[PDB]
Amino acid sequence: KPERKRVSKLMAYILRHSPEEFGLRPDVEGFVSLNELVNALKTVYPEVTEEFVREIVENDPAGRYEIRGDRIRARYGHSFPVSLDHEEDTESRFLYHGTPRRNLPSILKEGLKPMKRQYVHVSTDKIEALETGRRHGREVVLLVIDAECLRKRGFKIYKAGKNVRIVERVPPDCITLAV
Numbered sequence: 001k002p003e004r005k006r007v008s009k010l011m012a013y014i015l016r017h018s019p020e021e022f023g024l025r026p027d028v029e030g031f032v033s034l035n036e037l038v039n040a041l042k043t044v045y046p047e048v049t050e051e052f053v054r055e056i057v058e059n060d061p062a063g064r065y066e067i068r069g070d071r072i073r074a075r076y077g078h079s080f081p082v083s084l085d086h087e088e089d090t091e092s093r094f095l096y097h098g099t100p101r102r103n104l105p106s107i108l109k110e111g112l113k114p115m116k117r118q119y120v121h122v123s124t125d126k127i128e129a130l131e132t133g134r135r136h137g138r139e140v141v142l143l144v145i146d147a148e149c150l151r152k153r154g155f156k157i158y159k160a161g162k163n164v165r166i167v168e169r170v171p172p173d174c175i176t177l178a179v
């Protein structure tokens with residue numbers, strides 16, 4: 001529903017990108033006070049309550065958020081450094097990243113890089129990978145990433161969302177296919 005969606009979009013923006021511009025100071029792990037997040041959200045959507053934020057967190061289908069005690073964080077997507085959980089994805093054999101075709105000259109030479117984020121974000125889900133690439137351009141390619149290649153190279157893959165995984169970078173040898 002549009003109420004849930006518009007408050008969640010604002011939560012993700014505050015918690016991933018501009019907490020300080022709403023007066024919040026994330027701790028090392030990226031958590032802000034839940035009460036303080038609620039007041040920040042209410043500067044935009046005055047109907048928001050803590051109970052509604054708790055409902056958004058628990059019902060989020062991607063696993064975007066985490067509440068711990070009286071604090072809340074985004075679980076990935078940040079454009080500032082945070083220490084996240086190191087729940088390691090050891091089971092996935094391939095992972096996916098969608099990107100505009102125009103990026104293949106750089107990506108296939110340099111690998112995937114975190115760009116303005118802290119981590120490279122990949123997915124266990126091809127459609128969601130492609131839909132993320134579509135945010136950046138109409139002509140997108142599906143990158144297929146060999147998870148064992150990454151692990152062997154010392155790049156741990158972490159369970160950030162239900163489908164989202166994070167990794168420090170993806171060297172080009174680990175990009176097996178671009179479709």
Ligand SMILES: Nc1ncnc2c1ncn2[C@@H]1O[C@H](COP(=O)(O)OP(=O)(O)OC[C@H]2O[C@H](O)[C@H](O)[C@@H]2O)[C@@H](O)[C@H]1O
Nearest residue numbers: 076077099103106107110111112113115116117121132136
């Ligand atoms: N070496 C490179 N050269 C050029 N472009 C590159 C390179 N490596 C990666 N890119 C592209 O640089 C761009 C970086 O765009 P951004 O928005 O930061 O990353 P996202 O598109 O993965 O979205 C991650 C999402 O996953 C979670 O939901 C988060 O919350 C996000 O919503 C991509 O097109 C890369 O392919």
Ligand SMILES: Nc1ncnc2c1ncn2[C@@H]1O[C@H](COP(=O)(O)O)[C@@H](OP(=O)(O)O)[C@H]1OP(=O)(O)O
Nearest residue numbers: 004005008009010011012013016062064077132135
């Ligand atoms: N329902 C929801 N809750 C929270 N956040 C949401 C969201 N639906 C979308 N977002 C985020 O909005 C940005 C633009 O994405 P579009 O609207 O172009 O698809 C992007 O976040 P960012 O700028 O950090 O990359 C998305 O995050 P996500 O990939 O988790 O949906």
